[PDB]
């Protein structure tokens, strides 16, 4: 289980953070990613973090606006989103995977790279700027 | 307590129904209403139903597209929304009230008319239309 939290609606320009907590403790080779899907589009990679190093990698569309951070004590990660815009409206999914030897963590960007999935969290960004 | 369910995301042109169940058994005087709010706009009335008669009354913006139904057995009501579009994106709230003597049920259209509120349910309508 990957338990998710933080769904809501915000204005354009706002910030919002989602959280994902695993039922079992992450290991040094655990990778946590985030994906998103709005109806009519494909589920799309957002970003990921390597548990051991806290190294992260992002989709082009969110680089410089979103940050993923580790919360060791809570066995969790947080997806912190800023400069939100209506095109960030989506159901957001946490996932996790065990990094294969000889792979860079940043190769974990595709749906089948991840065997464990959360139930999804709605984030809606309205027009209407703060 | 008013318990809400049914939230999610849909396509433009889709239908979706939200439910609201009251912990206290409804009486003849019970009224159940729905409101919605998007950030940047005020909380607005959507529609309501009288438990005594099942008569309903709607905001102009949704009349003909949304329908509220009694669920006698569930002690609840359902808001079935059709022909959804992005303008219907909002957090939707169930609320209930006791009809005051002298008032038509359809007077129950304003926020302070309802002392009991649910926690709210998110509904998002994508600008993608369904493919049928």
Question: What does this protein look like?
Answer:
It is classed as unknown function. Keywords: nanobody, triclocarban, unknown function. The assembly is dimeric. The entry is titled "The apo form of the triclocarban-binding single domain camelid nanobody VHH T10". Chains A, B: Single domain camelid nanobody VHH T10. The organism of A, B is Lama glama. Two copies of one chain form a homodimer. With 130 residues, chain A is mainly β. The first copy, chain A, has one domain. Chain A is 0% helix and 51% strand. Chain A has no helices and eleven strands. The first copy, chain A, has strands at residues 2-5, 8-12, 16-22, 30-37, 44-50, 56-58, 66-71, 76-81, 90-98, 116-117, 121-129. In chain A, strands 2, 4, 5, 6, 9, 10 and 11 form a seven-stranded mixed sheet that branches. A four-stranded antiparallel sheet of chain A has the order 1-3-8-7, with no helix packed on it. In chain A, a hairpin with a 6-residue loop joins strand 4 (30-37) and strand 5 (44-50). Chain A is globular and about 45 Å long. The N and C termini of chain A lie far apart (35 Å). In chain A, 35% of the residues are buried.
């Amino acid at each position: 289980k990957l338990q998710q939290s933080g769904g809501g609606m915000v204005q354009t320009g706002d910030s919002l953070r989602l959280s994902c907590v695993g039922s079992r403790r992450a290991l040094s080779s655990t990778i946590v990613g985030w994906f998103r899907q709005i109806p009519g589009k494909e589920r799309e990679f957002v970003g990921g973090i390597a548990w051991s190093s806290s190294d992260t990698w992002y989709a082009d569309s969110v680089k410089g606006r979103f940050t993923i951070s580790k919360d060791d004590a809570a066995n969790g990660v947080h997806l912190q989103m800023s400069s939100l815009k209506p095109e960030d409206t989506a159901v957001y999914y946490c996932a996790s995977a065990l990094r294969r030897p000889g792979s860079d963590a940043s190769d974990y960007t595709r749906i089948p790279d991840y065997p464990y999935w959360g139930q999804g969290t709605q984030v809606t960004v309205s027009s209407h700027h703060h």
